[PDB]
Amino acid sequence: TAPAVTQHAPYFKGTAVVNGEFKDLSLDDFKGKYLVLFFYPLDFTFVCPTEIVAFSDKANEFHDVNCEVVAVSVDSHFSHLAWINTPRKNGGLGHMNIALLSDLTKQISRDYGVLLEGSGLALRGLFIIDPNGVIKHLSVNDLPVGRSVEETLRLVKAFQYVETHGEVCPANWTPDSPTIKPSPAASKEYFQKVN
Amino acid sequence: TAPAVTQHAPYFKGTAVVNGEFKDLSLDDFKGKYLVLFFYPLDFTFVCPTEIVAFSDKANEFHDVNCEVVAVSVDSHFSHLAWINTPRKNGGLGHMNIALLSDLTKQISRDYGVLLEGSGLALRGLFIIDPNGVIKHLSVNDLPVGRSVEETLRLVKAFQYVETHGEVCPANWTPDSPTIKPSPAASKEYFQKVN
Amino acid sequence: TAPAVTQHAPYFKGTAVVNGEFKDLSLDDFKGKYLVLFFYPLDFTFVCPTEIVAFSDKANEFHDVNCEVVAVSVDSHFSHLAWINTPRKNGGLGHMNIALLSDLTKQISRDYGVLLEGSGLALRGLFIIDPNGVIKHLSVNDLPVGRSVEETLRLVKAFQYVETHGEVCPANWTPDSPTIKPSPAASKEYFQKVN
Amino acid sequence: TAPAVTQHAPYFKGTAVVNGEFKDLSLDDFKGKYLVLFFYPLDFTFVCPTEIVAFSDKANEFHDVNCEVVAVSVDSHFSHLAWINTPRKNGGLGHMNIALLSDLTKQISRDYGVLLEGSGLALRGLFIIDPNGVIKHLSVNDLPVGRSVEETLRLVKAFQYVETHGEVCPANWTPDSPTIKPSPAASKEYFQKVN
Amino acid sequence: TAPAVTQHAPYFKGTAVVNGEFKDLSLDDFKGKYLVLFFYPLDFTFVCPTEIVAFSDKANEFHDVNCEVVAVSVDSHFSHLAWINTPRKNGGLGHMNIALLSDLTKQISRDYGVLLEGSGLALRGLFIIDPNGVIKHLSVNDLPVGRSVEETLRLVKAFQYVETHGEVCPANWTPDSPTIKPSPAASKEYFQKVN
Amino acid sequence: TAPAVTQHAPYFKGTAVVNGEFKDLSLDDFKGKYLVLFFYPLDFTFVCPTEIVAFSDKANEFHDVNCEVVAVSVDSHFSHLAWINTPRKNGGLGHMNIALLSDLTKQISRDYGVLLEGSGLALRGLFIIDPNGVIKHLSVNDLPVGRSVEETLRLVKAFQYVETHGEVCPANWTPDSPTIKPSPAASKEYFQKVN
Amino acid sequence: TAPAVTQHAPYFKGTAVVNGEFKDLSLDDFKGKYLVLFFYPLDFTFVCPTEIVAFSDKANEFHDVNCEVVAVSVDSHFSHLAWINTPRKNGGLGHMNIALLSDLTKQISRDYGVLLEGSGLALRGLFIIDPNGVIKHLSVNDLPVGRSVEETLRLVKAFQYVETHGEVCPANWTPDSPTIKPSPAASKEYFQKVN
Amino acid sequence: TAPAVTQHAPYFKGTAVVNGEFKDLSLDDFKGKYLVLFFYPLDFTFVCPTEIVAFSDKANEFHDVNCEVVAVSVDSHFSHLAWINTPRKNGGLGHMNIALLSDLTKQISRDYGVLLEGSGLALRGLFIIDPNGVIKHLSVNDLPVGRSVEETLRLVKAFQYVETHGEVCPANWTPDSPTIKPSPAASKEYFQKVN
């Protein structure tokens, strides 16, 4: 139970804003589902809203592949709601298709290893978590650079492809792209094909 | 020094294969340049060769933006070379535009927090390190899924952009896409442009 | 850890025939794959070979969905091989595409609660185990009635479908047929669709 | 008596809904008939109504082979009735040709080893119980995947065949399909025919 | 904690229907507020729908005095909703202004001393729990006689009057009728006035 | 026997004041009649005299429905009389049309689960015991809030109505308001009429 | 227990003057009632008599809202009494309508955190303790400035308003002024009304 | 240095919003001036905006007596700004005449002993601090009740009166109300005057 790949994700619990109303959210609530838990520093800032809207606009694609997406920061759930009720044109989020988790005690960010104690706020950490609570991917950016929603989805689709076909995913894999049977003899028909 | 974003990259030293020839590399050889330091589990496997050839094929684009790429694993440098002298068509690497660093003692992988201690091999870990040895990004995939060379290049240009221009990069930023002046008043300029 | 649905499948270890060669297998070897573990009473009987050759002939379809099939009985691996080298025309197995596991001590059967202690042989027990070692389905017949391979494959694909699409599978669900979003309002879409 | 193949099915008694009226059912009532006793988690859910209406629309075929079908869950007999009185378009059952038994105390599920005590509901257990109250078969699914009524019916027809013909049924046996005389010499007739 | 007057109400947790959606409630959710917690045997019965619609119709008058109203029974939350989507004309509930809590494990009823173990359903128990959260009044009818919502509201109002005025409420007291200063000399005012 | 609903009321015996004279009462003295047995803390207090005079004033209406009313407390029977010979104007009782039972040993209160051991006095417990002599309703207020005599009489009348009519009494039922035939088809009459 | 808001108030015990007579009282004695426990440094001083007289003239209004008022200092109950018998013109108190508690050992002042150890006298601490012995407000002034008796009465009425109406009290709230429903949608009614 | 009367106020430093601009504040920016430092739980709530707007509308009466007012909470300075930019009609602050200080690390609230570690927010703490950094008054409210702006002003003026003139202020003292010379002989003047 640690924030590192192949380990169980640390237990978390906070009040979230889901679909415009307050709701409590636990790690247990996603047993059976994939989860993209992603941290951002602060509400009403600059990179953060662009990521949050980008994930919200693609949320249906994540939900279609049994994946929930929850954004997490250290602000109150009241700040989350206020930011939801701000229009995008004025730096706000608008109506949200993803959960917004309040980590007001900072303990979720601390346990996920992404809190800068001096500042009191999370780095841009993202965690892809499988149905059994195991971490499959993680990535952290420094504050001034936003994450790729397209790449996050590519990875979720990829981890699902290997578990339901038993072939591994090459670099730059997309759906319908060739894959490799992970035995030396059988891996050849891939290598032939692309060269 | 720690393997965490915002902290100094841990020192490393080892034997590499540059340009068909053995050569010592350390972290200090990359001061002044950006560094993409990416770990892979084992030579003569499956996802690994597809990632190394993809980075080798795109190395001119990294070099044009003052970025070096080095692949690392727990194998010897004699393994690295033998794999270079295997045709791609047969699961090999062929000619190489990037360094292949040997981490025979495993200490590099351990110091970078990507060593599965029980198996004796590294996860798919990737670090972007700036001219001063500071880690700007890191990411870790489990073994069955390869990384994106495109997203690595995106992120490098994003960190360079914010250095040059004093502006922050939104989600899904490509070069020439809009950026955000990171003050409350000046940011509206961005949000109006895209809503 | 018990032979029950939702629980972790008991650890097992034994000698198996794989391509006419003796080879060890444990539950650990199938970490990452789905596993159909099916018990059958005795080698050189009547129903048993019809089941084993049915599973062997459809083995590629199982492997295409990241699933190993492993037939288990209380005979020695030396009997399994002898039975492979009997032709099917004469009640044998012939060439095999699945593993034949020997449970010579009878511990595996006893741990999976399919052992008839009185006779010292197992019932027609089938267990479907996910990549995570958790039992998704169990199924037992009395000795005179063989099982359906088509139905076992149906259940593997259904458990895979729910884990990658988040929808639940109706009765008699097949690939391409409708499914249900498991929420009260969202589930009406299914019920309108088929009435 | 225990919930295991070849053993006597445990005694149950409870209130059921039979043809719209409430009526007591006991295991005693099915002496002399075959019995498909199937458990489902909850009324007014998603997979459950699909399983129940599939069984109900085929009940004629079960009845024609002296077999009764009894659905069971932890809800009251009043929920059962209210659900019968909901249209199928709206997630209900409509008219039922099978009994819906209420296990309000949770005892029947506990006695048949399918109660999840933590949640207070039953897994997808199905038992084929013969005219002397012995269990010939049992299947269990995790909650998100429905069962096959088709296969349930194939198994009842198969067990009846061996009782009245003294020949064992191969894998994927269907009516009017070859069967095996279960002695070594006599069995060769089957194995020559199908090869 | 114990289900008796002057004692802290037992802790309870469970899934409730709150505005047509599945929420999670606990005794902690009502700290700071008076709670009327009332049990009823089963959904889709006779006296119960009359009790629940009576409270839901006067729910505003309880909210106006800092009081929540929660109906409890041993039914699933999916039944609670089905009953909410049955019209009152047809024995149903209609739109609800109170919570409907699922005691599916039967634990809450057991803990509050109202579970008839034999039949597995609750008696008509009612508890007025104060804001911290001590039981001030409990009442229990047998199954065929419904409670008075009027008297329940009289009692919440009486207990609130005594906390904020330091006088005690006579038999049959209603808002504005006389009260008693509980001191031998001071009480003479009350007794002189009403005789 | 136990002080709970559906159970036989505990046996009790003691000296009571009945028409200004010391009589002896027991639970056997009320076989054949409904009994309202109500406890109060202490004679010469504040809410208690108001409760006792309210019941004594409506005592005729209970007798007219075969019901006796008995007040109980831990005081001597000599206090009960002194209080009877205190005028109502001066905090007293006046002439009484109900019995006043002495629980001097505190045993009755203890047996009926209403004795606060610490202070040695009863809470405001009330029990409607039927004619043989099962408890049909119990209620308990804390000390500073008096009960409703009106509601007590409503409940005796409701329990008598259901015994002699076989219909069940809704919430807020009063003599002459509609009632429910407790059958799914029969109850439709009630629900149609009042909506 | 502790002298902080939201905690249980520390137990105290001491000899107090009530109606010119010595009488022991403790925190227990005020269970069920609000309490305003205020400390003052010393009898026969300057600000202190003006606080005590101000409360004692307003005490009728506190008792009318179920609130006791208790003055506490380190002086003897003999000084307290002597100060009562001094006239107000002459620096005294006169007849008193509030308790004067002697903290002669200084232990009450030590436990409430108001004791200046060097001088052996209390700061001007005030505590509003609710009916369950929980602190709702505290306030300390330095020695040369008296407290507002009006503001103390306002807060008691405010804390009672929120327990019996479920709405929160704005800044400068007085009885009959607007209050806020503490949900986000319902709070707009207030914010629109006052702006 | 501790959050107690007569002691030096703990040092704090944080980003505040001042005239729509971010700007660092520290305790020693307020040396030579009286400071009213008041904590509130969270931005975008209910009681908090009423206190903040009330103090801001009286800020000039504070400024004229050389007193500053600084509101503090654990929210980001960005939330403060988004909330300044929300109109009052819609639950916001609008223009502000006071600093809103961010306590993103929560250290300030922890140092002033007003933080609830469990939930991660401040109680309604308020502190008057003199020109030498010494605390003269403190008060904490529980969350549902707002403070009195008038009484804070009353107290700031009271504490100045005593430094200027060397006379003590009685209870309910207002500007130009009589004060007391703190000497036995002299204090008589006050007592003769006001009686």
XYZ file of C-alpha atoms in Angstrom, chain B residues 11-171:
161
model
C 23.894 11.127 -9.472
C 24.512 8.172 -11.806
C 27.575 6.741 -13.571
C 27.959 3.693 -15.813
C 29.247 2.159 -19.045
C 27.254 3.052 -22.158
C 27.129 2.139 -25.845
C 27.423 5.320 -27.880
C 27.825 4.956 -31.623
C 28.826 1.251 -31.569
C 31.553 1.950 -28.922
C 31.819 1.628 -25.109
C 32.022 4.928 -23.225
C 31.481 6.151 -19.641
C 28.514 8.460 -18.944
C 27.536 10.299 -15.799
C 24.818 12.799 -14.927
C 27.500 15.547 -15.215
C 27.926 14.805 -18.928
C 24.377 16.318 -19.355
C 24.673 19.641 -17.447
C 23.591 22.441 -19.805
C 21.394 20.104 -21.864
C 17.880 18.730 -21.106
C 17.986 14.966 -20.430
C 15.365 12.289 -21.072
C 16.528 9.406 -18.895
C 14.230 6.424 -19.415
C 14.451 2.945 -17.857
C 13.344 -0.331 -19.432
C 13.267 -3.813 -17.952
C 15.392 -6.086 -20.159
C 17.300 -6.433 -23.444
C 15.960 -8.900 -26.036
C 12.340 -8.516 -24.907
C 9.277 -7.077 -26.602
C 7.930 -3.636 -25.695
C 11.465 -2.467 -24.883
C 12.860 -2.650 -28.454
C 9.833 -0.749 -29.879
C 10.413 2.117 -27.424
C 14.172 2.322 -28.043
C 13.819 2.363 -31.851
C 11.038 4.999 -31.582
C 13.254 7.283 -29.458
C 16.229 6.518 -31.769
C 14.137 7.441 -34.821
C 13.030 10.746 -33.203
C 16.394 11.677 -31.627
C 17.086 14.408 -34.220
C 13.972 16.228 -32.892
C 15.261 15.974 -29.292
C 18.788 17.066 -30.340
C 17.346 20.067 -32.264
C 15.848 21.309 -28.934
C 19.016 20.636 -26.854
C 17.794 17.402 -25.323
C 19.663 14.114 -24.992
C 17.982 10.716 -24.609
C 19.545 7.726 -22.755
C 17.906 4.327 -22.319
C 18.960 2.425 -19.164
C 18.576 -1.139 -17.926
C 20.127 -3.702 -15.618
C 21.813 -5.550 -18.560
C 25.534 -5.355 -19.384
C 26.963 -3.203 -22.140
C 27.989 -6.382 -24.017
C 24.260 -7.247 -24.129
C 23.464 -3.695 -25.345
C 25.905 -4.035 -28.263
C 24.748 -7.526 -29.273
C 21.202 -6.183 -29.415
C 22.380 -3.248 -31.594
C 23.943 -5.867 -33.949
C 20.572 -7.677 -34.261
C 18.318 -6.540 -37.179
C 14.995 -4.855 -36.161
C 13.176 -7.337 -38.377
C 14.282 -9.997 -35.831
C 13.402 -8.147 -32.562
C 16.645 -6.144 -32.401
C 17.564 -2.456 -32.402
C 19.850 -1.954 -35.456
C 21.760 1.365 -35.728
C 21.282 3.681 -32.656
C 21.067 7.513 -32.290
C 20.893 7.384 -28.459
C 23.087 6.104 -25.660
C 22.296 2.718 -24.072
C 23.481 2.857 -20.449
C 24.270 -0.368 -18.518
C 23.178 -0.474 -14.900
C 24.896 -3.779 -14.102
C 25.077 -3.162 -10.278
C 21.381 -2.031 -10.293
C 22.275 1.045 -8.184
C 21.042 3.564 -10.786
C 17.596 1.896 -10.955
C 17.489 1.671 -7.145
C 18.521 5.337 -6.744
C 15.850 6.378 -9.232
C 13.123 4.409 -7.373
C 12.211 2.208 -10.372
C 13.800 -1.113 -9.268
C 11.551 -4.096 -8.624
C 13.872 -5.551 -5.968
C 12.545 -9.145 -6.162
C 12.902 -9.475 -9.989
C 16.083 -7.401 -10.330
C 14.744 -5.250 -13.150
C 13.447 -1.728 -13.706
C 9.874 -0.654 -14.484
C 9.166 1.634 -17.482
C 10.293 4.802 -15.686
C 11.066 8.068 -17.471
C 12.532 11.307 -16.152
C 12.867 14.761 -17.747
C 15.805 16.614 -16.213
C 16.641 20.250 -17.067
C 20.081 21.930 -17.569
C 20.570 22.249 -13.775
C 19.879 18.596 -12.863
C 16.383 19.333 -11.512
C 13.618 16.787 -12.329
C 10.775 18.522 -14.179
C 8.656 15.427 -14.910
C 8.702 11.721 -14.147
C 6.464 8.853 -15.237
C 6.209 5.099 -14.527
C 4.317 2.416 -16.502
C 3.966 -1.216 -15.605
C 5.837 -3.626 -17.913
C 3.167 -4.658 -20.459
C 2.487 -1.130 -21.900
C 4.904 1.047 -23.827
C 5.276 4.807 -23.546
C 4.658 7.636 -25.990
C 7.676 9.249 -27.680
C 5.362 12.096 -28.847
C 4.231 13.019 -25.349
C 7.814 12.967 -24.108
C 8.711 15.478 -26.882
C 5.605 17.580 -26.110
C 6.531 17.831 -22.427
C 10.171 18.790 -23.187
C 9.116 21.640 -25.465
C 6.550 22.690 -22.824
C 9.200 23.081 -20.108
C 11.434 24.960 -22.568
C 8.519 27.233 -23.584
C 7.811 28.346 -19.982
C 11.553 29.106 -19.455
C 11.819 31.182 -22.585
C 8.488 33.055 -22.356
C 7.384 33.259 -18.664
C 3.925 31.861 -19.617
C 2.369 28.508 -18.640
C 1.285 25.655 -20.940
C -2.338 24.435 -20.767
C -3.505 20.858 -21.064
